[model samples]
Target: HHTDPLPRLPVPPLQQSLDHYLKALQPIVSEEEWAHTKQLVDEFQASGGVGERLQKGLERRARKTENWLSEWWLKTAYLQYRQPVVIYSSPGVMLPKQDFVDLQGQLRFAAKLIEGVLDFKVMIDNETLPVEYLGGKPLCMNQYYQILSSCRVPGPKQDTVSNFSKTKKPPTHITVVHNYQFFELDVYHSDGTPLTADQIFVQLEKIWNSSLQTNKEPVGILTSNHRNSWAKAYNTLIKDKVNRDSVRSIQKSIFTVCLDATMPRVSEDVYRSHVAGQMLHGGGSRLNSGNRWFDKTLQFIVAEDGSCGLVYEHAAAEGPPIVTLLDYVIEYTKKPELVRSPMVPLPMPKKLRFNITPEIKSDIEKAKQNLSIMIQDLDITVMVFHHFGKDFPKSEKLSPDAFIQMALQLAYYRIYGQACATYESASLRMFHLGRTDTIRSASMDSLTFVKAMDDSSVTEHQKVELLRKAVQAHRGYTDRAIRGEAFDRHLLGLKLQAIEDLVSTPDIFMDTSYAIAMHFHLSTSQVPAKTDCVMFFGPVVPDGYGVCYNPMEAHINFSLSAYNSCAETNAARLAHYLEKALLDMRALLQS
Candidate 1:
């Protein structure tokens, strides 16, 4: 009956010995799989696999598998944690007092609500109401009763809601708000008035806006684990001693729900992905499973009255950044024979929308106009290369081409770094202040700094000062913490500040670089006067001519040979880096 072949031995080993022996046995893999494996191992051992064919294979495979698993873990973790579902239920949907008496029927619907709860982590109620309506209104009273009654409902559904489910949807409780006085009420009398309508509404609004109260917001029956019997049922499912504790460890690590409806509206999947990526990047374990993964796709529709509801548990994580998850969804969606309604155009989830007031828009326009006037009278192009080699000596002994190659390479490195720092600073500023004009100015300032540093006339002092100012301007604030208290550090600091103070003012440096470069290019004709001009210079010889220069010569060391051999190589690298920076710049521009 066993597919595993029985061991043939002179004598059967003791049970413990046999177990140990089996544990030590490596899988008896096929010869074809191991055929070239030994050769690979030998090749790896011989030369350390550096830049060899075998090395490349190992590198490629490692890169492929690591990248795939990393992304899979991210997507999986996002599905498990990120999305917050907005469940806005008003007082209208609660079941009547008579219906609350049906232990069996009430138990079934309680299970249904638990099923719906598995899809989301946080719930918010946007339904505003007047307090007087909660007293005699049947629907409102029933809804309030259901919120209280559901706490005691016992079964597997309750267990999944409270304990077993790793994602722990909706936090095992519904947050009930009466006319904006939000209560984490798990059990309360249906007819009881906790607070007057206006007092409750005002308190809710204040709680929503303030952070201090948010942390201490009293959680009533909704999030409490009062169903100990239900939790015990889950504990019985664990067979292994280690696994039982592992499940409990996971339960302790559940993400806390913050009751802030105003937190930027991010799609459940997108938000999840961001959180998951962050967690994985910090080396956290992912607790995604197929059951909850399937549940995540389902959308729970709380009928407008907030009384009755429908649950569709087949939702897919189909939102952005479409760069990763969309491709997989597209492939699956295309499999019409296997997938349900393959032809159905999957509707994109609604993204959070915010209304910007008119006053802010006008202020932004004025700032842009002011900047336009400030740049109008300046000669900016020459400033682009103004300070090249100000810290280091510009070698007069080297051939002109050799000088140019080194200058270009240095130019590309400094400029690229400047652009990156600028982009990041502008992004952070934008996030904090929510102003586009400031971001644009920060971007322009970065380019100006780079141009000035490259200017021929700018002294080392001027270069240092201007570059420092550019760096300092972007060192505005700290970012959100990844863990406990460590904010992601930016590269703007004392060194940069010192550079700013040491150098001439940024405006003068920028203008000087622009003027000098423009005039030199115009006079020499090495590069055209056009703003975006790029130039190439090297010897052209007959195709069949044998090599003239020694192949082993250091391209940068031999001046004459360097001029001939290095220009094209250096220029190509500079050009490529420039192209990449421009692409990022273009994205910023478009965004």
Candidate 2:
């Protein structure tokens, strides 16, 4: 019934996919390895029985569904992942600090922020929100609908995500967590007008004051456990009607607002670290004690010192929509009219308390212990490379994104001495229900450029030429990926087809080379924005680095994360190499 329905995802020709796959593999594998892989591809194609049948089935499925991979992609990529969503799956946005000093000031600022978000929601509900455009083409606005008033609830086999926007009436209240207590605040008054900042501030003050005297159990920590563990514990907790009611309210709320503990005045670098840490896992050892719901689609965090950010559950949405929401809030909050609006009377905030049983209490303790161990295993570091940025690359007539990607290739090469499987997210919003496509960054040209940079015998002009070609190569692949012509998702479709058809695992997928090729060593993405901060998430795989960058006019910011459990990967070490690579590339281009 959508008037401007999105285009369906298409299946590329088998021959075309093989050609692109081989081209992507050449840089990462030796000639001998390539020959063996080529042979495997030939065999898989020659069989023609299973391969042809699966392709036909996939094509038919694509024709039948608006977005063929939506459910499968969500289940496989997000829901079924057993890890806790807090540090593993959830991504955070660190907003620029607000001008607030005391708890009351922070509360007032938060009230304004909430009002700003509610206004944005008004735009959504009225269908007045503008559609986002990229490269002069309109992008699908489906994910925006999935962001607010939604949550991902854990299940035994897989989690389920529910969106309240489709209901007859969207939720009017939001859950606020502070000092391990959850309080409900209705954004709208009895007359359906949104509450003024002053009214919200008064309710927040009451909630904060009440939390001081009452000592409630930190039952929210249970959500920070692994999905399976949380699922089992969830079933137990819900057996008690009171606990079920509290959770139901939270799950159905428009969104969550977290009031974090205060921090000392720190430098920008230290402030960023604190913000990242808070949003990453929420006060570490407490394990979301003050974060009402870890699976809530959006959790707005505002610290006592007015350091604000967002910890968003990443199942049903991506970064761009979240960024758009934050940008709108920031712009709205800056207007003088919003701050000078008249106050209105509203209902008192409602406190939600759980009926904790001994068994549920035990689950909370176990979840805390598990979360402690998991937190210790994660290592995150941020690097601000001020040497050069998008301006420099643009001045040189190069794609800033591709230039940074090539620098990343050089950084990894400098550290590891070899190229490995790399993944960069390319937006596919041109299609219906499109999220991201794999822009496999490692190419023959990128490898050649990195190696030449390390070679003392290479001339400056030669290195520059190689770097240009490398950047061009990456841009080409990225363009094709955005157009739904990439090999990774198509390959994924074929693999899923084999499972659906109950065919034995194909030799192409069974090959060890195939496994190694998809094991991303340097998982990278560029989320460009007008803000100084960057988005952060943990590594996709254990022994890999998660790199999210924001390239600005003067400097480039990177949020680097890796698991400490993997002795080989160090977030700090990677940052060091990345810094050096940026400098080296800048010097090479200038020379």
Candidate 3:
């Protein structure tokens, strides 16, 4: 990456963002509603009106920091929001399922995974990581340095992240949980040499042997509750001296590893779905959910039945950086390093003790009830479209991500008879301290394309033309979005500036059209990986869906998530329509 004084995240011109905002709203909202909103926009952006004042404030803020929105984005979107991070805020990834099953391979691979991550860590600690580039321009490598040795600290009001990587006495130990019991496992020797995979495996054996009882209460499950409730429980549980120190060790650990007991699945057809649920929230209370501490920045799950994946705290970073590390570790596991060093005897990994008070037991029970209800309400379908993937789109000289987005819009329209606001994550890492901005997918071009594609009266040739236009439109937006020209963050900045200014909420933000634009009915991200993995997170809105995909050489891996509580959504139905939509688009191209 170039280090010649990179530019800060720029604030887009006020009128430019407002124009794009209204154009984006036209396809998703009613004509009358749009007209009303058009009036509001005109009034709001008038000379010396509310929008200009906020824009001026944002520009002043940008002059001070590399990213004006990064602070507020994190605060408003993640910190101040009081939802449980389990399925709603945090994302779960299903790594390529392993080949070996049961006791021996699970422990073996788990050991190797640890060594692999530590190997990756060496590069980060020494500033040796190769700078990553996208679209031939260097990206901000700051996020890579932030994730490792970090933890999210819960607060009575708003949560904060602690990055202990640069501490004078940085933590060398990692937390290990088994049978609902926690341990502080020191992965480094006193002499500063990292432990080999074999040595790590030996320690894991001791950890497993000592924690044989299944009757212990699942104290770890408390992290999965509502943030307000968890904050209260955090203060109450840590009042004791012993509990305080134990909790502190866990919070300060580099990361977490949970050796999960296998939870039963009903059938082979839906095995991936079961694993997705396991990785996300761990198949509810009595299953493996109790084994998880969801607040940890990175918690790696290794199950006895060979299911494995990770649940990440999204407050620190997004999927790209995490998946890149995962890809590295997966590759590292393949190379068998010849062990030339002789082993020395070491202490048994210290298992963390929890003396549950009667009050704490009641809290755990309440947390279990909360998590179980949430688990019951979520509907997830993990699917693989073996028919085709990036090849088809690339062969047609189309951007794979843009083409995939078209199919999503087409699928939604076929089911719902209308286009709604859709959110596609567009990385803003090209700018200093940049995070992410929305690429609104429900565009007028996409709406027209989906409508034409659905009607039998329309000629296939004409529909194909509309499809190409829609994909091109999406690609254009992505290009602008990645360049820090997107409107979502800008609009958000203006609104937040109003709130901070202590002014009456602007009429523009109070408009129903603004509400329609903000509610993302479809949330998506394309995380392409060589390892053939898929990531999934819950919808941003209750009545919406969250779709994540991995586009590989031949096929695509898809994880579609929705809520059973929403009457309008069905993950299975959406999966079916997406399959057909991809197929139909291919057929349109062929004929």
Number of the top-ranking candidate, with TM-score as the measure: 3
Task: Encode model 3's per-residue lDDT on 1-591: one tens digit a residue.
Answer: 536755789999999999999999989889999999999999999997888999999999999887898889999888888889899999998987787766778888998899888989999888889988887888888888887778777799999988888899888988889999888889889877788888888888899998999999998888999999989888888888888877777888888899998888559887889899999998989988889788888889998877888999999789999999889988999997876346898799887888789999999999999999999999999989999989999998889899989999999999999999999999998888789999999999999999899689999889999999999999999999999889999998998899888998899888999898999889999987878889999988899999999999889999999999998899989999999999999899989
Rate residue 500 of model 1 by lDDT: 31
- Provide the clash count, candidate 1: 31
Looking at candidate 3, the ten consecutive residues that score lowest on lDDT are 1-10
For each candidate, what TM-score against the reference? Answer: 0.18, 0.96, 0.98
Off by over 4 Å in 2: 1-4, 213-215, 263-271, 287-290, 338-345
TM-score of 3: 0.98
Candidate 1 local distance difference test against the native: 0.23
In candidate 1, position 14 carries an lDDT of 23
Off by over 4 Å in 3: none
C-alpha-based local distance difference test score of model 2 = 0.84
Candidate 1 residues lying further than 4 Å off, grouped into runs, are: 1-171, 174-591
RMSD in angstroms between candidate 3 and the native structure over all alpha carbons: 1.2
Model 2, span 359-455: residue lDDT tens: 9889988987888887788888878888878998899888899989988999999989998899999888988889888998998999999999979
Instruction: Give the alpha-carbon lDDT of every model.
Output: 0.23, 0.84, 0.89
**TM-score sort, best first:** 3, 2, 1
